[PDB]
Design a protein around this ligand. Structure first.
Ligand SMILES: CC(C)[C@H](NS(=O)(=O)C[C@H](Cc1ccccc1)NC(=O)OCc1ccccc1)P(=O)(O)C[C@H](C(=O)O)c1cccc(CN)c1
Ligand SMILES: [Zn+2]
Length: 304
């Protein structure tokens, strides 16, 4: 069975996407935007009060297989949305005025592998010609300074950038969807762990985005807001200087598509447990993260 305070395997998450949609058809619709390399369904949940000509925010989780708290957050977010709609004024206004496209698990094949074989797997599970080595790093697979830095051209490495930009069915599916909905998508949020950061462009180069002052101010406010709940401290900044230059990232790509608010989140913790964050921290992690996501949403809506 599904639990919002435990990590759920894909079979369970999948069943959840069907159930939560069935239980909230006036707030959620489920579509599939493609299949993974191993034929799993890439579900996308459209969360919001249905209406014509609505702007939208896109959020994905589960790019990297071992970052389990990421997957957990997308599920937590959906429940908060549906349970509080009509009662909490902000979320009610959010869902009335816009749609959240929530993609709960992008790299499903990798996620399954972390359950069945290797808890520390990161990449996809696609095969590579000429080698037994498996998988491409999805966050090096986008058309953003593709493979020019912070990436490997070797299929055996954890940062393999792929045979070409969007060589992975999963990243192609995500890019295709966003490209088809550019007119409506006003912000792109991509959830990772760990390190407690909010990153914004650019990561593929040290250059700064045209609106970097605004993004910095937005990130600073979001981290302040996050800290109010449990005191959790995040840092923030351009990806390249805040972690390290890394080309082919989905956040850089989305931004260069014209999506002016594009952020990567790195959730708890700072390395005590790392990727193996205990389920006992799921609730608190998700609750504080909600505050930052809602803050960003409120800002974006107020600046349409
Ligand atoms: C613990 C997290 C910070 C993950 N990092 S990781 O699993 O250790 C692998 C990652 C691989 C890499 C190679 C070359 C250049 C940059 C990054 N290494 C890394 O982040 O090392 C730094 C580090 C290590 C431990 C704790 C904090 C920071 P991530 O979510 O996988 C980081 C993410 C990525 O590597 O795709 C990322 C790095 C730079 C910029 C962005 C924004 N697009 C996103
Ligand atoms: Zn990651």
């Amino acid at each position: 069975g599904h639990s919002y305070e435990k990590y759920n395997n894909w079979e369970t998450i999948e069943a959840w996407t069907k159930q939560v949609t069935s239980e909230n058809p006036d707030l959620i619709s489920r579509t599939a935007i493609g299949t993974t390399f191993l034929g799993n369904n890439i579900y996308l949940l459209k969360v919001g009060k249905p209406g014509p000509n609505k702007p939208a925010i896109f959020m994905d989780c589960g790019f990297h297989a071992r970052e389990w708290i990421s997957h957990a957050f997308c599920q937590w977010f959906v429940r908060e949305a549906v349970l509080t709609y009509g009662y909490e004024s902000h979320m009610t206004e959010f869902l009335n005025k816009l749609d959240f496209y929530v993609l709960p698990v992008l790299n499903i094949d990798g996620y399954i592998y972390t359950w069945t074989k290797n808890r520390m797997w990161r990449k996809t599970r696609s095969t590579n010609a000429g080698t037994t080595c498996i998988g491409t790093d999805p966050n090096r697979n986008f058309d953003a300074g593709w493979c020019t830095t912070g990436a490997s051209t070797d299929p055996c490495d954890e940062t393999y950038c792929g045979s070409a930009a969007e060589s992975e069915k999963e990243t192609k599916a995500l890019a295709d969807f966003i490209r088809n909905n550019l007119s409506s998508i006003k912000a792109y949020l991509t959830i990772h762990s760990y390190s407690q950061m909010i990153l914004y462009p650019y990561s593929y180069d040290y250059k700064l985005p045209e609106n970097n002052a605004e993004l910095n101010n937005l990130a600073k406010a979001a981290v302040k807001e996050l800290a109010t709940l449990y005191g959790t401290k995040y840092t923030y900044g351009p990806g390249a200087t805040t972690i390290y230059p890394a080309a082919g990232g989905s956040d850089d790509w989305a931004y260069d598509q014209g999506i002016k608010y594009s952020f990567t989140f790195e959730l708890r913790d700072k390395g005590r447990y790392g990727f193996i964050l205990p389920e006992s921290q799921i609730q608190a992690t998700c609750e504080e993260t909600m505050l930052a996501i809602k803050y960003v949403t409120n800002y974006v809506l107020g600046h349409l």
